[PDB]
């Protein structure tokens, strides 16, 4: 439930930026809504399934 | 300037004109001799030698013109300028020397006559009979004065003499047959204004392509042809000449001239001399062309190259031939003698007995130890060019002809307002040394 | 208005020092030893005072000051004219006097009272009748020689003023005939053909149109002795050329018609419609492939600068050719007015043909410029003799590797300001990609992605820096250092790649090669070779892969090596291999994707377009705009002497020889008959050329002579007699031909100043002034002792090239902070207090920086002034200078050769170059430009003590270049109009660079970039200016040009051709032909033509003879006669011409011309005395 809502929000944030965004930015913006552990799990699962890739360590792009 | 791209041109290599079988030339023996030529005579600080050369040149001119002047019977009792103090007041004398300055006053003329021994001041009163001649004499000309002297230092003259042509001449023997001669000049091969069609029609005329009986008889009695200067346009005469050239290389200019002069029949002899735009000396007198640059006109089997100036004998008559660049000095000095009538300036040059007297004007003089521009012997016909206008006059038995040009009007000429007379050809009779007909080819231009 | 209390104090200090100098000048001058009893240089503070003190009429300052504030500058002139005609300023008499005074005053007001046109350019104003058509009155203006140097914009306004005056007075038009117009056309054409090439050549139709509509006559006296064909024209008194009138008509109403029509519409004058009409009538595919096409169609190459080439002055770049000068929009600390910025490295590598202050013949922006070092921009790229490629961007490396240079592939960069483009109205060439564009893109990307605000070139808040550093994972100190000096601090290549892959900005311009300088097929071949036969060492920064080394054998590379050279890629050759090092392997292999996508050639595409079509990191065109230039007129930092050196203004005639030595005449006891003025003592009756009586000690009175009866009258009786002889009724004169004995005068002077050890004292042959008042001989003795020279008015001058400067560092001029605080400086340009020698301090308007040669000369001048004050006048010393550093804080006067007014400055430092540094306002106040011009500097006290109006030449033009009035305050609103276009911004914005690709006119973004004009009126025009580019030193580089170390022409041409060969952007065969066509063939032909029409001169006398004397000796002297033109003058340039013909690929016309010239020279002197190009030429054909 919360994971399902969170992945869509993270996809929304990365979509409008259209470039790689640092993990600190997404952590600070989505931090109030969701705890750190859930955000990390969501990032790991999104990488595992595969719609986004990591060019440089700590930066995420579509 | 700015030289542009390369261009393709033609050198008249497929132009062939043949003789007409309807004309049979008359068999006449040929009597030509080159009486005078520059090449016949054989003539550290550099400034010293150059000054010495100029001094010797003017001394030689003075001596020659004095030897000419002394032949006048009315000239006698000649004294040296340095010995003028011995001259008594009542005794009249004569002085011969060069002219340094000529100044006009309200009561006469004042000259400055310089000889080998001194310089004196001469006064010619306005009432003198021979006063108009003194008003037209150019500087650096050898003149004579007659009069008295003053202890004040002024020579008072009442007569004035020039080295002229004598008034009496002997009647030369006649000829068994009649022979003519053609005089042309200023061909200017390689220029954009050169009239090709007119020259082709002229060549067709010499080969017996006519339509009148008189022309048929004249063409069969032509044995000589004389060209005086400016046979090619040259390169680098004035800035911007590249844009006015069809053949911008002097080797090809002489090649084209030779190709275009190979159609003159075999029974005609040609005499060619250098000009001002040719590959020759940059100052008169000019010995000849440069062999390595103007080779193709040396290989023609019926052409002999002459100098500027030269004297040619034809059946016993003397022809004086020069390009005639000294007409510009006389025109600039004497008022009333404009262009379009180049006869009177020629008369002045003849009656001063020098082809280019002024030094320092617009005629260059080379440093030669001896003066070769003095007319030592009186000729029968004098031919010149360089003016691009045809004229003919007679003075005391001699004929003076200015051959026209084969080049049409250019921008430089119409800026200075001179109208040329292209494609006019004089035909002279050797027996009489007179122009008897003028041919016109201006319609084809 | 509220000034910051600093400018007011500055001006007050300047006035205090000026008054201090004037006090002693006035105390000394009142003793009676000088022509006047008071100082002869009045001082003024604005335009009204100058106009009153230059041309009058009295009482005009108040009216001018009222009307300028009421209406404006332009209409106040018309109001003053109206008041003058109405008689508000007294009774003048005839209408000619009213017209002349009105024209002079109006022109002075419009020209701001600096240019000498109203005083010397206009000679007379007369009323004439149209005697040929209708017999109606019309106004005529007479011009003189000086109008030819008064400027184009000052010639045009005279016609307008004359038209207004003739309209106001109630006169008719000037109705000419056909002969007048034909004469004008002939005169213009003859002038252009014969005497000098006019800057603007008008067609005859334009001349006829101008002559048929101008309501006044434009005539003058004869200036050149060249006859004209048309003669005896009614109303014209001369048959020779009238240069001033025709030059006015050609370079005024025609060349400057836009300015004239602007003035006409602003003023409200009616009847000038024809000028307005003439003015108005006269005026599938990749991104970079199309931009190049539009660039070439809308901006075409110009070759007007390369038309003429003088030996010894090389050509540096062909017109609009890659490899020449790169274009960088900006302004340095010491450039901007008309001055270019050039790295010192490229000064060295062109064999030092360029030094600081050398003038260049530019192509694109204007016509000329001056070079000034800038050490921040890039330098040349060179190829060594062993095949290596280097980038030289500093002075020492250029000094080190000069001897091993084989080819200069790229010259370097040039800094040209936006104000030059505005002034010359030049379309904006597309901008190359540089550091500041990249930094603006960087900060914009940060703002758009992470909502962080940063400002380049300033100091930012700590919180923003920390936030950006946290988001970027870099050291905050590095970010702070990069954002304040983005032109000296650069990131490593891996950081640049990281920035491009994270933020989305393009690659750093430092690591961008000249990709568009090569064709795509060459890059495809290089790609295949690199994929097949290369060894690459890979590395990793954070996930990203970048190359570290490339080693490939030379045999497999083949012709692909030239591609690397054209790309500007540094590499080395060793042991039969080519090696690419660390920072450049990444630059070569990152835009190609590390060989992950194949490079293929595609039509209608460029290399960068193909790169950007398929790649993650995008690029920009590093080189797209190039500019050519040529050398001319090297720098000058010398003294000023009259043509024969002069140290005293005392006539000597021919009793002193050619050198005109008074001491030699005194030694031999000669008697000289010269034209001089005497004085008579009222009591004892002494007569002599001095002012004070040697016996009585009282002041004497001038003696006036009558030329007919030779009667002497003192000044009092002359005033009683109204300066007319009672018996003769003729005009009296103040001078007569008299005999003097130099020995007694010299002995008296030597005993008067106690100076004995003098070996030479040079004077003049005859005086030019009407008064012919001589100078005291004691001044000459002291000048000779101190080794200084004199000018035509009694002053000592020093001439130097002028360069601009706005900001400076104390370490460049050798001045401590304590001395600066004593002078008045307390802060730097950012507001911080002045505590270190490395800070940058803004320069005040009237403070100047002199050269060291100027200091060496002014030290002697100061010693002379002190000696004069101590011995001649009996007063305390003033300067007390032992070293040139003791002149810091003193005053000078600046002057220009075409002006009649000076400006006061202050000395604050010295440099080691050969130029004169000053504020742009200072040079604008002399009506002068910083593009190769030279001005003069003189000490203030010397000028006040020694200047006199009685020594000036009587002829027109004698008052030019003379300090008739000096200005003590500087106002930017009344200096000039070019300085109003100078940009004063710190950095150009993104809008400028984005609008650069659209090829916009500079008038479409004047509101974006701040200029000086936007600050006029407000107190902010005196301070707050900024600059874009910094520089380490303003005198770093060569000081003297190589052109001054070469004597022979063969050496000149050899060095010039070597420089041409070295540079890739110059075709040496084209240079070889231009030299022959422009300098060598004309000289040979002219000398050969002049040899046969020459003159001959004697050695003892100097008589000229038009033909040689027969005896070979002078008729009078008996001495040797020599030639004027010799054989050595017609053969000096023949060997160089033969070498050019034989070694360089020139056209056949020139070859044949030179060969025929050799033959002609050989042939002329005939009767007086296998591998060659001529022999091969004549043997081949
Ligand atoms: Fe001719
Ligand atoms: Zn006295
Ligand atoms: Zn008198
Ligand atoms: Zn002499």
Numbering used by the authors:
A (entry chain C): 206 to 267
B (entry chain A): 166 to 208, 218 to 619
C (entry chain B): 1 to 283, 309 to 1194, 1205 to 1216
Text taken from the publication that reported this structure:
Replication Protein A (RPA) plays a pivotal role in DNA replication by coating and protecting exposed single-stranded DNA, and acting as a molecular hub that recruits additional replication factors. We demonstrate that archaeal RPA hosts a winged-helix domain (WH) that interacts with two key actors of the replisome: the DNA primase (PriSL) and the replicative DNA polymerase (PolD). Using an integrative structural biology approach, combining nuclear magnetic resonance, X-ray crystallography and cryo-electron microscopy, we unveil how RPA interacts with PriSL and PolD through two distinct surfaces of the WH domain: an evolutionarily conserved interface and a novel binding site. Finally, RPA is shown to stimulate the activity of PriSL in a WH-dependent manner.
The Rpa2WH domain interacts with the DP2 subunit in a region that lacks any known DNA-binding domains, previously termed Accessory-116. Interestingly, the Rpa2WH binding site is 55 Å away from the active site of PolD. Indeed, the primary interactions with PolD occur predominantly within helix α2 and strand β1 of Rpa2WH. Residues I474DP2, Y475DP2, E476DP2, E492DP2, Y496DP2, V527DP2 and R567DP2 from an α-helical subdomain of PolD are splayed across a complementary surface of Rpa2WH comprising residues K229Rpa2, Y230Rpa2 and K233Rpa2 from helix α2, residues K222Rpa2, T224Rpa2, S227Rpa2 from strand β1, and residues E261Rpa2 and Y264Rpa2 from the β-wing loop. The chemical nature of the interactions at the interface is varied and includes a network of both polar and hydrophobic contacts. In addition, two pairs of charged residues are involved in interchain electrostatic interactions: R567DP2-E261Rpa2, and E492DP2-K233Rpa2. Furthermore, a focused 3D classification step in the cryo-EM data processing workflow revealed two conformationally different populations of PolD-Rpa2WH particles. These subpopulations (named class 1 and 2) differ in a displacement of the distal side of Rpa2WH, pivoting 7 Å around the Rpa2WH-PolD interface.
